[PDB]
Amino acid sequence: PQGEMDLLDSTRIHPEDYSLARKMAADALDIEDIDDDDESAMRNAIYEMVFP
Amino acid sequence: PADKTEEALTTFKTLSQNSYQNKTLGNAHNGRSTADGMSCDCEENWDTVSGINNACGEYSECINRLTSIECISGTCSCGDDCQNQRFQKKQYAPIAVFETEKKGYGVRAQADIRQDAFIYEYLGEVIDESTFRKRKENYDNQGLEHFYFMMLQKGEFIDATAKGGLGRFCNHSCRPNAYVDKWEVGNKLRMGIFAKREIYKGEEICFDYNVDRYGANPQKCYCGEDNCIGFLGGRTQTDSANILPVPIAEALGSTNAQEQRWVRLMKEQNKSIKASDYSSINEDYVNSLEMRPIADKDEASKVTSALLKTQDYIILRKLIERVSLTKDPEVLKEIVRLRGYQCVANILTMIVLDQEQQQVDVESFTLSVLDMLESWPNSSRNRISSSQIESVLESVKTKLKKIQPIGKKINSLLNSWSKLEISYKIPKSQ
Amino acid sequence: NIQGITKPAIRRLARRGGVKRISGLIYEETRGVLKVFLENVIRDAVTYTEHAKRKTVTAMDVVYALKRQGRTLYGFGG
Amino acid sequence: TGGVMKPHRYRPGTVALREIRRYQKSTELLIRKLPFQRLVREIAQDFKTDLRFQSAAIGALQEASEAYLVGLFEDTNLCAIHAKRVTIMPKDIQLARRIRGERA
Amino acid sequence: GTVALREIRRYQKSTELLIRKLPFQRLVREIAQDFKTDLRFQSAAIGALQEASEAYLVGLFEDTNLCAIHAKRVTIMPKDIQLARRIRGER
Amino acid sequence: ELAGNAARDNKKTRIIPRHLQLAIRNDEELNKLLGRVTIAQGGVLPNIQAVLLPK
Numbered sequence: 001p002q003g004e005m006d007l008l009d010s011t012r013i014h015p016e017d018y019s020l021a022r023k024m025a026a027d028a029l030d031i032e033d034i035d036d037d038d039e040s041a042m043r044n045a046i047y048e049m050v051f052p
Numbered sequence: 053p054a055d056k057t058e059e060a061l062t063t064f065k066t067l068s069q070n071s072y073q074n075k076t077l078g079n080a081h082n083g084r085s086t087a088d089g090m091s092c093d094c095e096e097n098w099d100t101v102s103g104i105n106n107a108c109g110e111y112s113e114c115i116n117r118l119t120s121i122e123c124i125s126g127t128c129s130c131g132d133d134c135q136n137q138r139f140q141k142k143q144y145a146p147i148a149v150f151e152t153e154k155k156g157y158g159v160r161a162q163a164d165i166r167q168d169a170f171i172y173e174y175l176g177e178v179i180d181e182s183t184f185r186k187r188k189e190n191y192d193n194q195g196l197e198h199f200y201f202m203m204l205q206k207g208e209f210i211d212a213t214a215k216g217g218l219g220r221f222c223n224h225s226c227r228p229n230a231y232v233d234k235w236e237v238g239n240k241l242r243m244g245i246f247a248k249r250e251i252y253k254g255e256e257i258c259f260d261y262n263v264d265r266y267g268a269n270p271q272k273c274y275c276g277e278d279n280c281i282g283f284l285g286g287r288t289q290t291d292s293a294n295i296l297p298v299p300i301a302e303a304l305g306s307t308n309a310q311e312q313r314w315v316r317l318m319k320e321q322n323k324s325i326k327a328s329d330y331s332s333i334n335e336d337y338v339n340s341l342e343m344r345p346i347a348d349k350d351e352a353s354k355v356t357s358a359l360l361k362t363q364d365y366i367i368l369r370k371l372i373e374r375v376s377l378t379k380d381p382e383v384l385k386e387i388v389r390l391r392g393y394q395c396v397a398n399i400l401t402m403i404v405l406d407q408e409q410q411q412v413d414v415e416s417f418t419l420s421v422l423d424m425l426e427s428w429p430n431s432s433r434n435r436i437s438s439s440q441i442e443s444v445l446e447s448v449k450t451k452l453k454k455i456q457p458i459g460k461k462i463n464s465l466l467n468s469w470s471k472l473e474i475s476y477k478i479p480k481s482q
Numbered sequence: 483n484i485q486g487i488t489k490p491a492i493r494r495l496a497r498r499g500g501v502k503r504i505s506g507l508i509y510e511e512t513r514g515v516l517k518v519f520l521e522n523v524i525r526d527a528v529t530y531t532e533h534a535k536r537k538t539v540t541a542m543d544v545v546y547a548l549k550r551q552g553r554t555l556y557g558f559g560g
Numbered sequence: 561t562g563g564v565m566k567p568h569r570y571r572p573g574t575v576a577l578r579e580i581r582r583y584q585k586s587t588e589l590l591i592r593k594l595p596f597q598r599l600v601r602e603i604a605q606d607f608k609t610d611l612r613f614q615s616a617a618i619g620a621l622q623e624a625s626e627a628y629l630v631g632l633f634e635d636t637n638l639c640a641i642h643a644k645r646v647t648i649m650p651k652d653i654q655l656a657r658r659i660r661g662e663r664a
Numbered sequence: 665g666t667v668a669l670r671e672i673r674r675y676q677k678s679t680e681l682l683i684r685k686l687p688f689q690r691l692v693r694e695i696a697q698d699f700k701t702d703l704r705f706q707s708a709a710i711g712a713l714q715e716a717s718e719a720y721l722v723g724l725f726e727d728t729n730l731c732a733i734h735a736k737r738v739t740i741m742p743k744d745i746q747l748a749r750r751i752r753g754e755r
Numbered sequence: 756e757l758a759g760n761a762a763r764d765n766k767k768t769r770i771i772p773r774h775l776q777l778a779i780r781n782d783e784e785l786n787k788l789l790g791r792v793t794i795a796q797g798g799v800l801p802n803i804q805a806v807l808l809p810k
């Protein structure tokens with residue numbers, strides 16, 4: 001999930017909204033240890049949401 | 053006791069050698085004929101006075117003797133009549149039969165026998181498994197109260213009931229002075245009986261049976277040995293299997309070895325440990341248990357299960373102490389996912405709201421359980437909301453308001469927890 | 483398929499050398515040294531074959547490479 | 561009372577010394593043919609593919625590898641005996657290779 | 665123990681020969697005498713023999729030190745000498 | 756010659772690589788000459804250490 005490639009690069013979402021999409025994905029999975037500034041946890045959450 | 057040698061001999065057909073149901077059974081290497089038979093490199097040592105070939109003796113370096121294989125004449129460099137032809141030459145030790153108090157006939161040494169010396173070759177009919185089953189059923193129908201079967205190898209047994217030798221009269225001893233061994237003679241397999249120690253004249257010759265009952269009922273052992281297990285059976289044990297349930301025992305860091313050690317140290321030294329039952333907790337075992345930090349999430353799940361199951365004060369004390377030793381953040385996050393706070397609420401309530409103990413000891417417990425609550429990583433009151441343990445903390449600081457260190461620690465704890473939030477968290481449909 | 487050199491096989495190989503007891507950690511070490519030796523001999527045989535303008539490695543290349551490493555083999559047409 | 565007395569087990573080393581004599585008397589290959597062939601093909605794949613390997617080349621490679629491993633285990637057994645042990649350890653393997661010159 | 669490390673440090677940095685020249689010369693002549701008599705020797709041949717024998721003995725002592733280290737000892741023994749020679753292949 | 760003799764102690768009329776390996780390794784000077792050669796299907800001479808044996 002922390003790799004060079006990105007899940008959202010295969011979607012129509014603009015790169016300026018990648019953190020918005022990862023916050024949506026993290027909040028949808030009922031995670032509570034998540035902080036907005038932690039990009040790594042956001043990427044892990046969206047990876048487990050799209051590719052469980 | 054009076055000799056019963058001839059009387060014992062008349063009870064069965066005496067054999068000088070093992071008889072075979074067929075030529076295929078009992079063959080060495082599962083019948084694979086090793087044409088390159090194992091020839092010892094010993095040089096023949098003929099004593100010119102007695103004309104005896106002393107090669108392959110006890111203190112000689114015969115490889116075949118060490119490997120429990122007998123030299124065969126005409127194949128080995130040791131020559132004929134070497135000192136490793138004990139089975140073939142039938143040079144049995146001198147023995148007598150005497151009537152025992154409870155075991156019937158038994159074998160005694162007519163002379164003093166050296167260590168590792170060959171006593172006697174166990175004789176019988178070599179039979180297959182089906183023949184063994186048929187004979188076993190027939191003898192059980194006959195009501196015979198004596199074992200007469202030995203396992204030559206897998207699927208191949210030796211029967212000593214109707215035909216055999218004096219070795220069938222040897223009685224079981226739980227601390228035996230002799231032992232049975234398996235040897236290779238030519239392309240065949242033999243079962244001999246050898247002296248485990250120095251045995252004096254008149255002493256009974258006994259070996260460990262190591263009985264495979266094949267579902268038969270236990271038979272009580274009357275050997276008289278102090279280390280007797282009391283029954284004939286290839287296995288035996290004490291309460292050294294479980295003292296506490298497996299998830300609860302592994303929650304405390306205890307395993308099969310630690311559950312063995314406590315019972316071995318006390319029960320075998322005249323101190324009482326009850327029969328296996330987890331309804332009553334033995335506090336002394338839990339206090340004496342060793343504690344190591346947790347670094348595995350399955351062990352954390354077992355700890356959570358133990359918290360949800362065990363009601364004992366002392367087990368919970370030692371689990372909380374183990375958690376105090378534990379400092380791995382991932383295990384603590386797993387406990388949070390398992391809602392450890394929910395279990396800790398009940399653990400508190402049972403001890404400091406219900407009062408089955410003393411106020412000083414409960415105070416020590418409370419000081420020993422507030423520390424890891426203060427220490428664990430926390431990022432959101434959603435964690436606590438799954439337990440509402442703060443309410444329990446308020447109730448216990450209100451009850452033990454006289455003990456001001458507990459009150460001040462709970463003040464610090466609620467102050468720390470109240471700073472938490474969840475920034476912005478998207479509401480979900482309901 | 484380095485795990486194809488199974489534990490009983492390497493136990494047998496040690497047993498031919500007269501070894502009575504075997505440590506539990508030795509098997510990875512034997513697999514490594516066998517891999518190193520095979521790597522060297524296979525490399526030399528492959529470049530011998532590539533010089534010979536062939537596409538199939540014959541036994542002569544193997545025996546040549548081994549003899550050039552001071553490990554002369556008798557019985558394969560040397 | 562139809563039970564069977566068990567022959568118990570051998571001491572550690574007795575069956576070891578037996579199988580020592582048996583394997584030192586016989587001469588067959590001790591490594592299975594097909595896994596060794598696959599391993600040789602895997603090593604050869606790294607340089608240039610489409611390389612056919614005659615059965616005689618694989619057999620010669622197997623014989624050389626077995627001879628090398630047997631010699632290494634003899635030297636490592638001498639090393640273990642020298643250190644008053646009967647169990648060989650990887651440190652004896654490394655030392656044997658060091659003194660042999662194979663490892664720099 | 666201190667001067668042992670001092671001797672190691674001094675001799676591992678030096679390059680001159682440590683075997684005395686005249687006894688080695690007499691040793692070479694004594695060995696060569698029993699193969700053929702009235703043998704002459706170039707000085708450079710004796711020097712080459714001295715250098716080669718010193719290099720060989722240094723290598724043997726290094727391998728022997730490894731063997732001694734293996735047996736949890738610090739003192740080298742003759743059994744280390746024949747162990748190193750046996751493994752190295754000399755008879 | 757040495758290989759035929761070694762076969763003769765084995766009561767065989769067939770010379771095999773095993774007998775050749777026995778003949779080479781049991782003779783000191785022949786072992787010295789053929790030191791660095793491996794005989795295919797020759798096996799190893801039976802040699803068990805003295806302190807390797809039990810007591």
Ligand SMILES: Nc1ncnc2c1ncn2[C@@H]1O[C@H](CSCC[C@H](N)C(=O)O)[C@@H](O)[C@H]1O
Nearest residue numbers: 155156157197198199221223224273274275
């Ligand atoms: N120590 C012991 N106490 C009571 N019975 C024993 C015993 N050791 C052996 N036995 C009995 O002896 C049987 C073995 S056959 C031994 C000889 C036979 N009991 C006789 O006197 O003629 C076993 O099946 C067992 O039932």
Ligand SMILES: [Zn+2]
Nearest residue numbers: 092094108114
């Ligand atoms: Zn012998």
Ligand SMILES: [Zn+2]
Nearest residue numbers: 108123130134
């Ligand atoms: Zn003999």
Ligand SMILES: [Zn+2]
Nearest residue numbers: 226273275280
């Ligand atoms: Zn008993």
